[PDB]
Design a protein around this ligand. Structure first.
Ligand SMILES: [Cu+2]
Lengths: 147, 148, 149, 149
């Protein structure tokens, strides 16, 4: 039974280590209790004291024994990447998506946003003519807008 | 039966005219068909060809006979005035309010937004520590965020 | 200041009484405090102890002095009347309207339901091909499906 | 190589008779048109779907069939609130209310039965209204879903 993050590989960790990833979809990162089969057969239970409120992030270190590591890998998904032109537009989009109850993530740049691809959201985004592309891509839990 | 905006007093019109106002609440600006009793007793019927989608605005000229005018006043209401500090914060507010299905309007400056007062909306805005004030004020339909 | 329902004219009351109605839209039925001008000039203030949770209903007797009565009238409104085939269909309708966050009322019969007319709601009801008709009609607050948020 | 059509469903027996390799899906995964899978017995399978049944892949949809060698869809079980409504009024209430929550909703085995994923608020609600329900580890067939259009 895993209890706490031993932090995240991002704090290198230039491996250096054999790393056995657990593979999560973006929406799975928030369970406190769940059972997993890691990439290399292994078994892993989790119960979380202080599960970072926004969820598990990329490479969160679940387990660490010697150089033997287990970390969180977040699977890629179809993602509508949104490029708003102005602050007025950001507001429009967010409100409108919020109204849709779809999920929404901050993008890499200041007017960029990412949301799971769904066709109604897509339809919406064109109806208001915002500039967007669908890419298979990663959605970091730490990028999510709470709600 | 009134049919047409003869425009809006904002295009002066330095009155100049005895103006009898019809007094609408903000949520009332969007009927196409309804009946009214103006400020000074009179009676008005409306059916709208091209009712500006966003609804009736402040001083939309309903009726114009000589210097005798009837127009739309919009009554003040309790309003939460929201002042976002960042574009990050804008996004968060709008998403969260949209997620609540509350109404939202653009503010006077760039990170200002106005939403009707409701206690849950307020509760929300504190929970996120956004800086806001409740003021009795006017909501322009021209200032609203759609939902399409 | 009016305080209690003295009931409702439905408990006849075959008038018998000069009745002066107060006219409320279906969404207004739930203020505990507000002021009114009745149908024949009169003025009424309200403050409610035990405002029946769902709101004021049709002909809720506000005021009763002799045979002189004031009651609640509920402005008839545009209403989609829904006639469901089967329980399955009921469940589909209710879930889908619920999902829309529209308002919903029990009809007269078992598979009848009433909801305010909105064009997307109608659109929807055709998209599923449910049988309905729009009528101008009353929406009794006692007939509402509640909600908890 | 790539799978294109359902060759139907085992339900149309098929009293196996066959060695059947299943593909194991969660109930939310039944609606991808393009994805890659490793079957129960290691095999590899890609899908692209013309006329993917709108509501999703169902229990035992035959992806692949070569001789007596078969690949079918299995839907993994999950925690499931099983709801047993006493009346048609109560169905409507439940569905509208859940609809309003935006929870997922499936037709049960019997007429007044409905199944929705387990979540604690959905539970919370269901008691608040005093509906009779039980949580059970079980299967949510995609064909049993209440749309939303
Ligand atoms: Cu909603």
């Amino acid at each position: 039974i895993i209890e706490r993050l031993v932090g995240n590989l991002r704090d290198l960790n230039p491996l250096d280590f054999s790393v056995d990833h657990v593979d999560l979809e973006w929406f799975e990162t928030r369970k406190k209790i769940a059972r997993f089969k890691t990439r290399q057969g292994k078994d892993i239970a989790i119960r979380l004291k202080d599960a970072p409120k926004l969820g598990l992030s990329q490479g969160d270190i679940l387990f660490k024994e010697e150089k033997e590591i287990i970390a969180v890998n977040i699977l890629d998904s179809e993602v509508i990447h949104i490029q708003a032109k102005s602050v007025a537009e950001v507001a429009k989009i967010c409100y409108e998506i919020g109204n849709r109850h779809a999920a929404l993530y901050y993008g890499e740049s200041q007017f960029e946003f990412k949301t799971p691809f769904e066709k109604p959201t897509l339809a919406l985004l064109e109806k208001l003519g915002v500039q967007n592309r669908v890419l298979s891509s990663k959605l970091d839990s730490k990028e999510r807008l709470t709600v």
